Design an enzyme around this catalytic site. Structure first.
Site, PDB file in Angstrom:
ATOM      1  N   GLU A 192     -12.574  73.761  65.230  1.00 40.02           N
ATOM      2  CA  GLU A 192     -11.733  72.665  64.777  1.00 40.02           C
ATOM      3  C   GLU A 192     -12.423  71.361  64.410  1.00 40.02           C
ATOM      4  O   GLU A 192     -11.812  70.283  64.484  1.00 40.02           O
ATOM      5  CB  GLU A 192     -10.642  72.429  65.841  1.00 40.02           C
ATOM      6  CG  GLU A 192      -9.441  71.675  65.358  1.00 40.02           C
ATOM      7  CD  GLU A 192      -8.767  72.279  64.133  1.00 40.02           C
ATOM      8  OE1 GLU A 192      -8.922  73.485  63.838  1.00 40.02           O
ATOM      9  OE2 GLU A 192      -8.042  71.530  63.471  1.00 40.02           O
ATOM     10  N   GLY A 237      -1.341  60.927  64.047  1.00 41.79           N
ATOM     11  CA  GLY A 237      -2.252  59.997  63.403  1.00 41.79           C
ATOM     12  C   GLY A 237      -3.436  59.600  64.231  1.00 41.79           C
ATOM     13  O   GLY A 237      -4.233  58.746  63.856  1.00 41.79           O
TER      14      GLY A 237
END
Length: 180
Positions: A71, A145
């Site tokens: 990731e 975010g």
């Protein structure tokens, strides 16, 4: 207190705000012109760094010896300035700590620091259907975010924030060997 002082100095020296076609992320420069983003940032041939177009000369989506997602995407920037080498603050293996700080810096969360408490080496997680390893976990009220955020403790950069669910956040451990 020490984790905070370290975080602030680290963010001022090595971080920037990046926008790819997929979102706005916090981004940490590691050494030379190599930086890191959450794999899902999916950088393209150019990114926007501190609001300025910067070409991406190379990018590597990291997977382990058996193809398992980590990731993280490493990117080599077309940039003259070098990042101050922070490889010495990157561990050889997943680190656990009692008090960590997650630092974020985007137009949504400018210059914000979060005390996240304990970080545990969780390991395996199925991320959005994607089998992922080397996950570090911590609990705090998450918000969208925050990906790209830098997870740190005194003298240590533990990882990069790659996702969060409710009151649970997780980072991909940022290991020394990813940068040689």
């Amino acid at each position: 207190g020490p984790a905070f002082e370290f975080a602030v100095a680290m963010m001022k020296r090595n971080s920037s705000t990046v926008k790819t076609e997929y979102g706005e992320f916090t981004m940490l420069g590691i050494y030379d012109r190599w930086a890191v983003l959450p794999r899902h940032a999916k950088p393209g041939p150019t990114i926007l760094m501190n609001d300025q177009e910067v070409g991406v000369l190379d990018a590597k989506e990291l997977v382990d010896k058996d193809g398992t997602n980590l990731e993280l995407t490493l990117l080599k920037l077309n940039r003259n300035e070098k990042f101050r080498d922070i490889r010495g603050f990157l561990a050889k293996e997943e680190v656990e700590v009692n008090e960590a700080v997650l630092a974020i810096n985007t137009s949504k969360f400018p210059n914000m620091y979060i005390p996240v408490g304990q970080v545990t080496e969780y390991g395996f997680l199925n991320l959005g259907g994607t089998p992922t390893k080397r996950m570090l976990m911590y609990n705090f009220p998450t918000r969208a975010g925050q990906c790209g955020g830098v997870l740190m403790s005194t003298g240590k950069v533990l990882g990069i924030h790659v996702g969060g669910n409710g009151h649970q956040g997780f980072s991909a451990a940022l290991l020394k060997h990813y940068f040689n």
